[PDB]
Amino acid sequence: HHLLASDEEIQDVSGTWYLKAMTVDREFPEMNLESVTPMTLTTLEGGNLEAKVTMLISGRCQEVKAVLEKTDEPGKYTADGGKHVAYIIRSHVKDHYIFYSEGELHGKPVRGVKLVGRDPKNNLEALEDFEKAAGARGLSTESILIPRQSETCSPGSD
């Protein structure tokens, strides 16, 4: 009775979530996430999932759009790149989900765990659960950043 995140509809994900934690290896620094925008998880006919979020990388607003294509392995998703394998997990807390992904950059393996869910306004229990995922993934000692919730991408000079 374990599973992962793909019973009949990931228990309804749809909606604009947020990012509360993002582990970033200490190999590729330069690019540093300064702020993040609400994550929009669109459920495609329950078959595929689309996640659109804008990140503030080094003052630069990077619009991200990942498509979680369902595979023959429930709880596993991939992108056209076939080199990006995303795994969606249901945090131990409500309104919280652990997002993980694996692949490679310029010929080097790269991954990352992201904690999404802020409905109840920050959850320490979820952070621990996530911090467990990172641990379980050995990413509990990376750069771990909690990008403030920025409903919109913009430095913030006002």
Short mmCIF file of C-alpha atoms in Angstrom, two decimals:
data_model
loop_
_atom_site.label_atom_id
_atom_site.label_comp_id
_atom_site.label_asym_id
_atom_site.label_seq_id
_atom_site.Cartn_x
_atom_site.Cartn_y
_atom_site.Cartn_z
CA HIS A 1 0.00 0.00 0.00
CA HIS A 2 2.76 2.41 -0.99
CA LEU A 3 2.18 3.85 -4.46
CA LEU A 4 3.48 7.29 -5.40
CA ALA A 5 1.17 9.75 -7.19
CA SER A 6 -1.08 8.35 -9.91
CA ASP A 7 -4.15 6.47 -8.70
CA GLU A 8 -6.92 7.87 -10.89
CA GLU A 9 -6.06 11.58 -11.00
CA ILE A 10 -3.23 12.30 -8.55
CA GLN A 11 -6.14 13.13 -6.24
CA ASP A 12 -6.84 16.32 -8.19
CA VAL A 13 -3.77 18.55 -8.51
CA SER A 14 -5.10 21.38 -10.72
CA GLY A 15 -4.48 24.89 -9.41
CA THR A 16 -1.77 27.51 -8.87
CA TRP A 17 0.61 26.24 -6.19
CA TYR A 18 3.80 27.81 -4.97
CA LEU A 19 7.40 26.77 -4.30
CA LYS A 20 8.66 26.63 -0.72
CA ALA A 21 11.96 24.78 -1.18
CA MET A 22 14.37 24.04 -4.01
CA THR A 23 17.62 22.10 -3.58
CA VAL A 24 20.38 23.14 -6.00
CA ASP A 25 23.64 21.19 -6.21
CA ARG A 26 26.80 23.15 -5.42
CA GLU A 27 28.33 22.32 -8.80
CA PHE A 28 26.46 24.88 -10.90
CA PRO A 29 26.10 28.08 -8.79
CA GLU A 30 26.32 31.23 -10.98
CA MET A 31 22.65 31.02 -11.74
CA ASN A 32 20.84 31.70 -8.47
CA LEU A 33 17.08 31.69 -8.01
CA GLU A 34 16.10 35.02 -6.46
CA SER A 35 12.31 34.60 -6.57
CA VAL A 36 9.61 32.27 -7.84
CA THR A 37 6.09 32.69 -9.18
CA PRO A 38 3.03 30.48 -8.30
CA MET A 39 3.32 27.11 -10.01
CA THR A 40 0.46 26.39 -12.35
CA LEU A 41 -0.22 22.66 -12.54
CA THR A 42 -2.59 21.95 -15.41
CA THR A 43 -4.01 18.45 -15.57
CA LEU A 44 -4.35 17.19 -19.13
CA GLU A 45 -7.27 14.78 -19.46
CA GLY A 46 -5.69 13.20 -16.38
CA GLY A 47 -3.26 11.65 -18.86
CA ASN A 48 -0.48 14.25 -18.88
CA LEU A 49 0.30 17.15 -16.56
CA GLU A 50 1.62 20.60 -17.44
CA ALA A 51 3.52 22.70 -14.95
CA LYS A 52 4.19 26.36 -15.72
CA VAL A 53 6.19 28.53 -13.35
CA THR A 54 8.26 31.65 -13.71
CA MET A 55 11.52 31.79 -11.81
CA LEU A 56 13.65 34.81 -11.10
CA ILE A 57 17.12 33.60 -12.00
CA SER A 58 19.80 36.16 -11.26
CA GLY A 59 17.28 38.97 -11.84
CA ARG A 60 16.21 37.22 -15.04
CA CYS A 61 12.62 35.97 -15.24
CA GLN A 62 12.76 32.45 -16.65
CA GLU A 63 9.40 31.12 -17.79
CA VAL A 64 9.38 27.37 -17.28
CA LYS A 65 6.89 24.96 -18.83
CA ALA A 66 7.29 21.28 -18.05
CA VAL A 67 5.01 18.61 -19.38
CA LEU A 68 4.71 15.50 -17.25
CA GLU A 69 3.99 12.76 -19.78
CA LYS A 70 2.65 9.59 -18.19
CA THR A 71 4.79 6.50 -18.72
CA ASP A 72 4.27 2.76 -18.33
CA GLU A 73 5.40 3.24 -14.73
CA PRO A 74 2.71 5.03 -12.63
CA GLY A 75 4.22 7.80 -10.52
CA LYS A 76 6.81 8.53 -13.19
CA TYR A 77 6.73 11.25 -15.80
CA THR A 78 8.96 12.32 -18.67
CA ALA A 79 9.45 15.18 -21.08
CA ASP A 80 10.06 15.07 -24.83
CA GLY A 81 13.72 15.20 -23.81
CA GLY A 82 13.39 11.59 -22.60
CA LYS A 83 16.28 12.68 -20.38
CA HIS A 84 14.06 14.39 -17.87
CA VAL A 85 12.22 12.00 -15.58
CA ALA A 86 9.90 13.79 -13.19
CA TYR A 87 8.40 12.11 -10.17
CA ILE A 88 5.43 13.58 -8.36
CA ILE A 89 4.92 12.65 -4.73
CA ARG A 90 2.26 13.53 -2.18
CA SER A 91 3.99 15.13 0.80
CA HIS A 92 3.07 13.83 4.23
CA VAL A 93 1.13 17.07 4.63
CA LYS A 94 -1.94 18.46 2.87
CA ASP A 95 -1.73 21.01 0.05
CA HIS A 96 1.88 19.90 -0.25
CA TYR A 97 3.64 17.96 -3.01
CA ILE A 98 7.23 16.88 -3.56
CA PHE A 99 8.54 17.29 -7.08
CA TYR A 100 11.70 15.53 -8.25
CA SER A 101 13.47 15.32 -11.60
CA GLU A 102 16.53 13.62 -13.07
CA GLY A 103 18.55 14.09 -16.25
CA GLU A 104 21.77 15.82 -17.32
CA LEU A 105 23.07 19.21 -18.31
CA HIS A 106 26.13 19.75 -20.45
CA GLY A 107 26.94 16.03 -20.23
CA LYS A 108 26.68 15.93 -16.45
CA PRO A 109 23.83 14.33 -14.41
CA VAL A 110 21.45 16.82 -12.81
CA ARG A 111 18.38 16.57 -10.63
CA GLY A 112 16.52 18.54 -7.98
CA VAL A 113 13.76 18.30 -5.43
CA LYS A 114 11.13 21.02 -5.14
CA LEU A 115 8.59 21.48 -2.37
CA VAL A 116 5.35 23.00 -3.55
CA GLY A 117 2.39 23.94 -1.40
CA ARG A 118 1.66 27.07 0.57
CA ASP A 119 -2.09 27.04 0.93
CA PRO A 120 -1.86 26.93 4.78
CA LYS A 121 1.00 29.42 4.58
CA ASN A 122 4.29 27.57 5.11
CA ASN A 123 4.27 24.12 6.73
CA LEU A 124 7.24 22.98 8.81
CA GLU A 125 6.02 19.40 8.71
CA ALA A 126 6.02 19.50 4.94
CA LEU A 127 9.46 21.04 4.93
CA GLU A 128 10.71 18.17 7.05
CA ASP A 129 9.04 15.69 4.74
CA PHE A 130 10.64 17.41 1.81
CA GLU A 131 13.89 17.64 3.72
CA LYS A 132 13.52 13.90 4.01
CA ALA A 133 13.14 13.57 0.27
CA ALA A 134 16.26 15.61 -0.31
CA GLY A 135 17.94 13.54 2.32
CA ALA A 136 16.64 10.36 0.72
CA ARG A 137 18.09 11.89 -2.43
CA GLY A 138 21.23 13.21 -0.73
CA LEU A 139 20.24 16.77 -1.56
CA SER A 140 19.75 17.84 2.04
CA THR A 141 23.09 19.63 1.91
CA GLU A 142 22.93 21.52 -1.40
CA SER A 143 22.03 25.19 -1.76
CA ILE A 144 18.44 24.71 -0.52
CA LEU A 145 16.60 27.90 -1.24
CA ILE A 146 13.16 28.96 -0.06
CA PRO A 147 12.28 31.56 -2.77
CA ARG A 148 9.77 33.99 -1.33
CA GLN A 149 6.30 33.74 -2.86
CA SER A 150 6.21 36.31 -5.66
CA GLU A 151 2.76 36.24 -7.27
CA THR A 152 4.57 37.97 -10.13
CA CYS A 153 8.10 38.08 -11.53
CA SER A 154 9.76 41.38 -10.69
CA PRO A 155 12.81 42.48 -8.61
CA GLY A 156 10.71 44.37 -6.05
CA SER A 157 11.73 48.03 -5.93
CA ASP A 158 8.59 49.44 -4.31
#
